[PDB]
Write an enzyme that holds these catalytic residues in place. Structure first.
Site, mmCIF file in Angstrom:
data_model
loop_
_atom_site.group_PDB
_atom_site.id
_atom_site.type_symbol
_atom_site.label_atom_id
_atom_site.label_comp_id
_atom_site.label_asym_id
_atom_site.label_seq_id
_atom_site.Cartn_x
_atom_site.Cartn_y
_atom_site.Cartn_z
ATOM 1 N N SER A 80 0.810 -1.213 0.000
ATOM 2 C CA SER A 80 0.000 0.000 0.000
ATOM 3 C C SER A 80 0.851 1.273 0.000
ATOM 4 O O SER A 80 1.851 1.361 0.719
ATOM 5 C CB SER A 80 -0.929 0.009 1.216
ATOM 6 O OG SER A 80 -1.850 -1.067 1.155
ATOM 7 N N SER A 129 2.264 -6.949 1.629
ATOM 8 C CA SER A 129 1.132 -6.240 2.201
ATOM 9 C C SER A 129 -0.115 -6.412 1.326
ATOM 10 O O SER A 129 -0.513 -7.545 1.044
ATOM 11 C CB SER A 129 1.541 -4.763 2.340
ATOM 12 O OG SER A 129 0.610 -4.018 3.095
ATOM 13 N N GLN A 130 -0.753 -5.315 0.905
ATOM 14 C CA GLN A 130 -1.943 -5.421 0.053
ATOM 15 C C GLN A 130 -1.586 -6.231 -1.210
ATOM 16 O O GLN A 130 -2.415 -6.977 -1.741
ATOM 17 C CB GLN A 130 -2.487 -4.026 -0.336
ATOM 18 C CG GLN A 130 -3.688 -4.126 -1.278
ATOM 19 C CD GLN A 130 -4.312 -2.800 -1.679
ATOM 20 O OE1 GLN A 130 -5.131 -2.751 -2.614
ATOM 21 N NE2 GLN A 130 -3.955 -1.722 -0.980
ATOM 22 N N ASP A 171 4.020 -8.211 13.535
ATOM 23 C CA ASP A 171 3.394 -7.610 12.350
ATOM 24 C C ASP A 171 1.920 -7.984 12.463
ATOM 25 O O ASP A 171 1.506 -9.105 12.140
ATOM 26 C CB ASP A 171 3.990 -8.129 11.030
ATOM 27 C CG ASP A 171 3.371 -7.450 9.804
ATOM 28 O OD1 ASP A 171 2.390 -6.692 9.952
ATOM 29 O OD2 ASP A 171 3.861 -7.670 8.679
ATOM 30 N N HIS A 184 6.072 -4.531 10.330
ATOM 31 C CA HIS A 184 5.530 -4.614 8.963
ATOM 32 C C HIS A 184 6.482 -3.968 7.948
ATOM 33 O O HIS A 184 6.404 -4.241 6.751
ATOM 34 C CB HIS A 184 4.161 -3.916 8.900
ATOM 35 C CG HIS A 184 3.446 -4.093 7.596
ATOM 36 N ND1 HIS A 184 3.020 -5.320 7.132
ATOM 37 C CD2 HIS A 184 3.029 -3.184 6.676
ATOM 38 C CE1 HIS A 184 2.371 -5.162 5.994
ATOM 39 N NE2 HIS A 184 2.359 -3.875 5.693
#
Length: 197
Positions: free
Chosen positions: A26, A104-105, A159, A172
């Site tokens: 992201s 992530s995303q 995370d 993260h």
């Protein structure tokens, strides 16, 4: 360094043996973000510049933070974009071995795309690496319809996205070392397991 469109720009008459498709996290820049370039340089070292094509997921994938809250962990438009890239790879270079990854995303996007992909193409993805996998708890550390032996998840202790939350904490942002070593090591091993050499 953050934008690579080797598959889109590449000549079908001179296809690479390995094609890597990667989705950034992201708010990250270009189509590779912060971790992608590190993995790419190590893949180039192993297979040579003309031996591997690095392709980031750009286009409709805007890596909008808010989209991580949608049902599949990303938008429908983003999934269509990544599916389109896998389909382009399959068409442009039928004999290339594929590898994928996401952060992530982008990890949720890679998982969603692979889950929806036609099995004949999905079965060509020799290995997939996921960093800060946002659907780690929900999917029990797996990518639906994809074998565990071809999957490697990097989820740091602390995370929160790995334990069912969308909160971004310091761990993260600590995947740099993994992207420089174990992630490409895994991808290289999985490609060589099926291609030999």
């Amino acid at each position: 360094r953050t934008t690579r469109d080797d598959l889109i720009n590449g000549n079908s008459a001179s296809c690479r043996d390995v094609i890597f498709i990667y989705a950034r996290g992201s708010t990250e820049t270009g189509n590779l973000g912060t971790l992608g370039p590190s993995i790419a340089s190590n893949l180039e070292s192993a297979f040579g510049k003309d031996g591997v094509w690095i392709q980031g997921v750009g286009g409709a994938y805007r890596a909008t933070l808010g989209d991580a809250a949608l049902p599949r962990g990303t938008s429908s438009a983003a999934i269509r974009e990544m599916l389109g890239l896998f389909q382009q790879a399959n068409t442009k270079c039928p004999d290339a071995t594929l590898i994928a990854g996401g952060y992530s995303q982008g990890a949720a996007l890679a998982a969603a795309s692979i889950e929806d992909l036609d099995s004949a193409i999905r079965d060509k993805i020799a290995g997939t690496v996921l960093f800060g996998y946002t659907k780690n708890l929900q999917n029990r550390g797996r990518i639906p319809n994809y074998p565990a032996d071809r999957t490697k998840v990097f989820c740091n202790t602390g995370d929160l996205v790995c334990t069912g939350s969308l909160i971004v904490a310091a761990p993260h942002l600590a995947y740099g070392p993994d992207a420089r070593g174990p992630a490409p090591e895994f991808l290289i091993e999985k490609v060589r397991a099926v291609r030999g050499s």
